[PDB]
Amino acid sequence: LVKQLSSNFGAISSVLNDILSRLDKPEAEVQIDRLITGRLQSLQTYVTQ
């Protein structure tokens, strides 16, 4: 579950702060949504198991 944080699920960067400090607001939002989606899946998978 921890390692999955590094996956970078289609986003430009696995680090949330890196996205926020590099892209503009709406530009970051579309990248953040990808990290959120992947992390939601990772948590849901963990709990299910």
Partner: protein
């Protein structure tokens, strides 16, 4: 429960120099796209907010980064690529764009990070005894690979009749034109573009933004910015041996967990501020309104 930061610590190198953009932008005569000017930029401070705010530009387009806040980040391995092009830049020079330039003149990466800055130049000597030439609109084989440049193009054949020079062919591949055609046509082709390529990684920064630094702390939760790397936690002294070529650390999984300070070269460990779950221990509200609170771990 989460401990909040008390101070914001911004740290950048001891450097006081300035970035030589003007030296590329308009200091001298411009090179053709094939013979594009590749200038390495390092050991300088670059304020890109000037170019953003400045006039006399047709396009200020960034990829991978915002057009703003470019002055808030440090970059390494910075290169400025200068070209002379037609105003038809859109759909010719771009990441993932199969333009004529992209395929056979100058190839830009699909994962390119940086800024493309372009402007027109209708107040030059191009119409007054100008020696402007070196336009290209012919192909050779396949793509040129990103950021590569040819130095030959002496012999070109692409088909049958292998005469090593026949008129019934795509002759004069290099130097296809020079047709500035002063005052006439839809664009005279005065357009100049500079592409700023940035790398953003663990490697030491070579170009800094126009930002001042502040002091350090040893035992309290703070916000921080180390060469563009941001986050929060407690900054403490490290007792581990980071070699001279090592700027960042890493835990068993991820997160730097330690950084090298850009001005003192000392190593600081980064410990996430204290936090934990908060739960309420209560009897029924139909019995009592007094509760106890547990802060977990």
């Amino acid at each position: 429960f989460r401990v909040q930061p008390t101070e914001s610590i911004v740290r950048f190198p001891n450097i006081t120099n300035l970035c030589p953009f003007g030296e590329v932008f308009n200091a001298t005569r411009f090179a053709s796209v094939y013979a594009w000017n590749r200038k390495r930029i390092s050991n300088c401070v670059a304020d890109y907010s000037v170019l953003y705010n400045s006039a006399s530009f047709s396009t200020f387009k960034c990829y991978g980064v915002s057009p703003t806040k470019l002055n808030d980040l440090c970059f390494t391995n910075v290169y400025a690529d200068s070209f002379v092009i037609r105003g038809d830049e859109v759909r010719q020079i771009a990441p993932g764009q199969t333009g004529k330039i992209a395929d056979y003149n100058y190839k830009l990466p699909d994962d390119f990070t940086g800024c493309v800055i372009a402007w027109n130049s209708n107040n030059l000597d191009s119409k007054v005894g100008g020696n402007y030439n070196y336009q290209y609109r012919l192909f050779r084989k396949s793509n040129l690979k990103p950021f590569e440049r040819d130095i030959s193009t002496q012999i070109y054949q692409a088909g049958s009749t292998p005469c090593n020079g026949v008129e019934g062919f795509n002759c004069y591949s290099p130097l296809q034109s020079y047709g500035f055609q002063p005052t006439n046509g839809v664009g005279y082709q005065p357009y100049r573009v500079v592409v700023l390529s940035f790398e953003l990684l663990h490697a030491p920064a070579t170009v800094c933004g126009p930002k001042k630094s502040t002091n350090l702390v040893k035992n309290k939760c703070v916000n921080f910015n180390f060469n563009g790397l941001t986050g929060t936690g407690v900054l403490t002294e490290s007792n581990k041996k980071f070699l001279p070529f090592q700027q960042f650390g890493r835990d068993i999984a991820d997160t730097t967990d330690a950084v090298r300070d850009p001005q003192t070269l000392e190593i600081l460990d980064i410990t996430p501020c204290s936090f934990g779950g908060v739960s309420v221990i209560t009897p029924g509200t139909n019995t009592s309104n007094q509760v106890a609170v547990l802060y977990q771990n």
